[PDB]
Amino acid sequence: IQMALSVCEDLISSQVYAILVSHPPTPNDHFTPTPVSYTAGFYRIPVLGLTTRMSIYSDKSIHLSFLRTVPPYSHQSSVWFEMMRVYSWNHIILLVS
Amino acid sequence: ILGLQLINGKNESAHISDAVGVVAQAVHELLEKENITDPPRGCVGNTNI
Amino acid sequence: YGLPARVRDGIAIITTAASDMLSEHSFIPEPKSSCYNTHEKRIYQSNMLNRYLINVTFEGRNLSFSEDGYQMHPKLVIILLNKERKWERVGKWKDKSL
Amino acid sequence: SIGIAVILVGTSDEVAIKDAHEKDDFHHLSVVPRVELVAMNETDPKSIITRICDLMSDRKIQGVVFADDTDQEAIAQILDFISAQTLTPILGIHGGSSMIMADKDESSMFFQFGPSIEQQASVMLNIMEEYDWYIFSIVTTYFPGYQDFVNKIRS
Amino acid sequence: IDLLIKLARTMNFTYEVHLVADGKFGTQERVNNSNKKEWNGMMGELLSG
Numbered sequence A: 001i002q003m004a005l006s007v008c009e010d011l012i013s014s015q016v017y018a019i020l021v022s023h024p025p026t027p028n029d030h031f032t033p034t035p036v037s038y039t040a041g042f043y044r045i046p047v048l049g050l051t052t053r054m055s056i057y058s059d060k061s062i063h064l065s066f067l068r069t070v071p072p073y074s075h076q077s078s079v080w081f082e083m084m085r086v087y088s089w090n091h092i093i094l095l096v097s
Numbered sequence B: 001i002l003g004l005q006l007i008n009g010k011n012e013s014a015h016i017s018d019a020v021g022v023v024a025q026a027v028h029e030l031l032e033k034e035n036i037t038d039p040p041r042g043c044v045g046n047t048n049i
Numbered sequence C: 001y002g003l004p005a006r007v008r009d010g011i012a013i014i015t016t017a018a019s020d021m022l023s024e025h026s027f028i029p030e031p032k033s034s035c036y037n038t039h040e041k042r043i044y045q046s047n048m049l050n051r052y053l054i055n056v057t058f059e060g061r062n063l064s065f066s067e068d069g070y071q072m073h074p075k076l077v078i079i080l081l082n083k084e085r086k087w088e089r090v091g092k093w094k095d096k097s098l
Numbered sequence D: 001s002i003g004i005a006v007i008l009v010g011t012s013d014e015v016a017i018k019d020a021h022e023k024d025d026f027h028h029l030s031v032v033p034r035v036e037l038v039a040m041n042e043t044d045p046k047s048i049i050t051r052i053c054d055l056m057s058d059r060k061i062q063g064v065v066f067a068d069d070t071d072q073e074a075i076a077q078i079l080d081f082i083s084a085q086t087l088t089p090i091l092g093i094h095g096g097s098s099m100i101m102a103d104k105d106e107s108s109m110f111f112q113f114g115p116s117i118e119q120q121a122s123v124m125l126n127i128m129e130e131y132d133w134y135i136f137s138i139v140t141t142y143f144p145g146y147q148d149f150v151n152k153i154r155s
Numbered sequence E: 001i002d003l004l005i006k007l008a009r010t011m012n013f014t015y016e017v018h019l020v021a022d023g024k025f026g027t028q029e030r031v032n033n034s035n036k037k038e039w040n041g042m043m044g045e046l047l048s049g
C-alpha cells in the first residue's frame, strides 16, 4: 500500500525514464511490480524487468510497456518440443494445473 | 525426476550490467532526434503524456 | 437515467446488500479502519458478503451483476451523426426489444 | 451504522445532488447509510490515494460509490487497483469510471455501469436484421477486448 | 458382429461390445455458450476415449 505513495511523490518528480523491477525476498510472492507498473504505466513510462517470472504481464492488454530480460515460466515448452523429438518420443501425457 | 534449469537466473546483480548495457546505445539513438519532450511534473501537476 | 437517480439507485445497491446480510448471518464484520493492517485482519473475509451482492433490488427490479462486472439488463440508445455534428436520438433498447 | 462515501469530479451542484440523498423511507430495514458528500478535482491518482485511505480512517465505511465526469482512458484501471487491494466494494457510474476493460482480479469487487462488450456485438447485429443489412465487413485494431468481440460475431 | 469376430481371430486382439449411450449416430452441434462444437452419440464417444 505504501509503494503507491512513494512512486508518485518521489520518483516521477525526479524525471525518471526507466525503472528496474526489484526482487521479492521469497520467490513465491507475485505482487512485487504490481503497484509500480500500474502507476508507471499510467503515463506510458517504459519499465524494464529484472526478476519477473510471471507471464501475466505479457498479455499485451494489461501492462503494455512491461519489458523484461528474464523469460517467465511459460517459455519452457519451447525446449520440451525438441527434447522429445530428438529422444524419439511422440506420445505424451500432459498434466497441468 | 528429470528437469531443466537456467544459468544466472537468480543473481540479480549479474543482470543489472546487461540492464544498463542495452540502454547505452538506445538513448544515444533517441538523443539524436527532434521534438524531445519531458516527463510529467509530479503526480498532481501533470495528467497528460 | 440521470446522475441524481444514478446516485440514489447506486446507494440503494450497497444498502440492500450489507444490511440484508444481518437478517440471516447476523454478524457485521468490522475491518481494521486504517490504511494498514490489511493482511492481519484477513480473518473477516468479504466472500460471504460477495456471495449475494450481485443480486440487488430497489423497490422491485432485476439488477443482477455479471461476474465480469456488467449489468445483465442495461438500457441502451442508438445515435446518428447529422449535418451540424450533433448526435440525435434514433432508437431505444428495452429488454431485448427494438 | 455503516457510512457511505461518494466522490465526484467535474462541474455540478453539490447541494442539489445531496438534497435528495436524505429522502429514502427505509423503514423496512435499518440501513442507516451515512452518505458523505466529497467533491474535488481528483483526476490525478495523487489525490485519490491519500483520500481513499483517509475516508476509512476517519469514518468506518463498508461501501463506496464513485462517479466522475472525465474522459480518462486509464482511470478505471487504476481505480480497480484500489478495489483489488481492498475488500470494500466500489462502483463506477459515469465518466471514465465506466469505460470498457477486459478482466477483473479475483479480489477485485469492482463493477461498472456500462454496456457489455459482448452485448454491443449482439445489439449492433440486432439492428442490421431490422434493416436487412445482410452483408458486412469487420475491421478492428489491438485493444483489451477485441478478441471476445469477434467471438460473438462468428457464433 | 460376425465381421468383428473375423478380425479378432486374425489380429489376436480381445474385445468387448457395449451399445451407445443415447441412441443416435452422430453430428456436430453447438453448445449453449460460445461457439464450441462437440459431437454426440456414437461418433462422439470414439474421440472421448
Ligand SMILES: *[C@@H]1O[C@H](CO)[C@@H](O)[C@H](O)[C@H]1NC(C)=O
Pocket: E011, E012
Ligand atoms: C496372437 O497372440 C498369441 C498369444 O496372445 C501368440 O500366439 C501370437 O502372438 C498370436 N497368435 C497367432 C499369430 O496365431
